[PDB]
Each structure stands twice: as structure tokens, then as C-alpha cells.
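#help-structures
NK: newbie question, is this the right format to request a structure? protein is Kinesin-like protein KIF11
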Amino acid sequence: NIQVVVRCRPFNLAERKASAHSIVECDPVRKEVSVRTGGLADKSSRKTYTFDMVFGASTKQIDVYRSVVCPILDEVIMGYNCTIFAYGQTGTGKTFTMEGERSPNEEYTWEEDPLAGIIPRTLHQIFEKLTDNGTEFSVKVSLLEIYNEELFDLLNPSSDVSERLQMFDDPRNKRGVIIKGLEEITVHNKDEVYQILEKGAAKRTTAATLMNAYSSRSHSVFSVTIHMKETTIDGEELVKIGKLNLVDLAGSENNINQSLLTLGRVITALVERTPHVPYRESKLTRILQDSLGGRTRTSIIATISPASLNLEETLSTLEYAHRAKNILNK
Ligand SMILES: Nc1ncnc2c1ncn2[C@@H]1O[C@H](COP(=O)(O)OP(=O)(O)O)[C@@H](O)[C@H]1O
Ligand SMILES: CN(C)C(=O)N1CC(c2cc(F)ccc2F)=C[C@H]1c1ccccc1
Ligand SMILES: [Mg+2]
């Protein structure tokens, strides 16, 4: 049930000038990614994996959006909860995929930059889809990050990143939590999107000078909640509420990351049908437990490098992403 897709990033400039040989090969039509485990392009051993979808190095941001994000967003608009994880070693594209970047030299506006990732595209498309049709709606965003098992709010513009948030169990709905003090920013319109994201980037920058290897070791949960009151051309009123969680996981490479460690143990228990699932052994899994064998539709985008240097890690990621396919929720 849980959908897993692989995205291999292309060689960088440093690898181009050094004329690197890819040890990875993607076959989209056959949902397969093959890795050269022994060595030699003239002769060698290989490891093959089949996923729900595979995107090679030539894959652009727009292809990922139209193929994976567009459908999941439609479900969110129908009043469903959805989660998308980015998993992989540091430097393989987790952030590029989830957030994206700006083309150099102010060549485009944020709405047309082809390097934009899932988050900016999604927020722009929500206003694009709902403004057209006859739908009343409000959009709230929240960016919750975890570092060394502490919670930080990267959007509240009146607190510094030195102020950690407290988490409690929600006495109302079971297997859910309450983050005391988490800010929910209302995004009144499309032309309010960019600055909200810029605010988070800046606050993030201070978080980085305050905590060691912050961008590598933390988990970022960027959520978008949509309260909708649709009125068909007839006069029917549909009151739906969708929530989409975009999670940029800590680098999977190997102090300790309790949330990362627990995510793997939770997945293991879920696929091996073990009765006890360690959701409570980390903040990440308590916050997103409904996305792990719960009533949420979740997808996992595993990112990998094509360089022969990252062989061991590319195999761990692929092997990890494959087992996750067996998780069943709803
Ligand atoms: N699909 C891609 N196309 C072009 N460049 C990419 C792609 N994926 C990653 N990169 C580049 O690779 C580097 C690794 O980026 P990043 O997304 O920050 O990795 P991670 O978040 O997994 O640590 C960046 O310089 C980024 O621009
Ligand atoms: C300077 N840059 C790249 C940015 O400001 N950002 C900020 C950003 C971003 C920052 C966050 F905190 C949380 C989620 C995000 F998505 C992604 C981009 C972006 C890239 C292309 C088009 C629009 C936004
Ligand atoms: Mg990163």
C-alpha cells in the first residue's frame, strides 16, 4: 500500500570534470533501478530493485510533480490526509526534491523557476486549483523540525530557534499529539507564499549556526492544511479538510538520531507484522504515526547518488526503501 519511488540525481560538475562512471541505471518503464556492485562496465555483478516508480538523473522537477505530487494533492483536496517522505544519504537530493532551489542570476520568478521543488509548487497549485472552481478555502502552513529529539518552530517570527517546543499526547483523538506553541501561518493568497518560505530559510540559517550539522541531522515536517467549503454549480456545499505533510528526513548515512533509528524500527515491525510498533520511542514517529500504518496515504521518495563512492549507502537506501513497500495503511 505505501508507495515508494526512487530518484537518482545526476553527476555534479566536480564529477563531470573527473569523468565519473555511473554505477546506477534506471528503467522507468519497468519500475526498476540497477546497481553495479562488483565493478567493471565490461563485466560485472549487479543488484536490481523494483519500486512503484523510478526517476533517473534526467528527471526534472516538473516530472516529479506531475507524476507523484499532482495525484496526491487531488486526494488532499478531497478531504484526505497525505504524507510524502524524502529518504536518502546526505547530498542525494532530499531537499532539492522537497523544496527545490532558485535558478541563478534572478532568471525566473519563484512561480516559474524550473528548479522549484514539491513545496513551492504545491502551494502555488492549491491557489491555482481552488481559486478557479467555486470553492471557499483557507490555507495554513506549519514547519516543525526535530533536532536531537527537540522540537523547533521554523516559521514563528517572534521566537528564536533556541526555544524548543513541548509535545503531549492528545487526550481527544488517540495516537495523535499536541505541539504546544506550534505556529500555523495562514497563507491568504499565492503572492504570500514565497516570503513565508523565505522566512523559514532565514530562521533555519540561525538554527544551523546554533546546532552542529543541522541540515544533515534534523527532520523537517512542512505541513499544509486546507479548510474547504465547496459549492457545486447546483447548490451543494461540501465541507472538506485536507492535510499534506512534506517530510525531509535526516540524512540516512552512518552521535545518534533517535527519530531516524525509530523510523526504521517502526517500519520493520509494520512489515514483519509484529504486534508492538515502537511509535513512541521518538518524536518523529509519534508525530507522524498515522502516516505509518495508519489512515493516511503516504509515499516515500528515496534519493540516491550514481557515483561509485556512495555504493554502500546507495544499497542501504534502496534496500530500506524496498522493505517499506510492504507497509499497509488505512
Ligand atoms: N535532481 C537533481 N538535479 C540537479 N541537481 C540536483 C538534483 N538533486 C540534487 N541535486 C544537487 O545535489 C546537491 C545535493 O543537494 P541536496 O538536495 O541538498 O541533498 P540532501 O538534501 O539529500 O542532503 C545540490 O547541490 C543540488 O543542487
Ligand atoms: C532561496 N530559496 C531557494 C528559497 O527561498 N526557497 C525556500 C524554500 C523552502 C524553505 C523552507 F523553509 C521550507 C520549505 C521550502 F520549500 C524552497 C525555495 C524555493 C525554490 C524555488 C521556488 C520557490 C521557493
Ligand atoms: Mg538537506
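mod (FA): yep, format's fine, and the C-alpha cells are attached above. Residues 99-102, 110, 113, 115-116, 119-120, 143, 197-198, 200-201, 204, 222 surround N5T (ligand 2) (CB under 6 Å).
NK: thank you!
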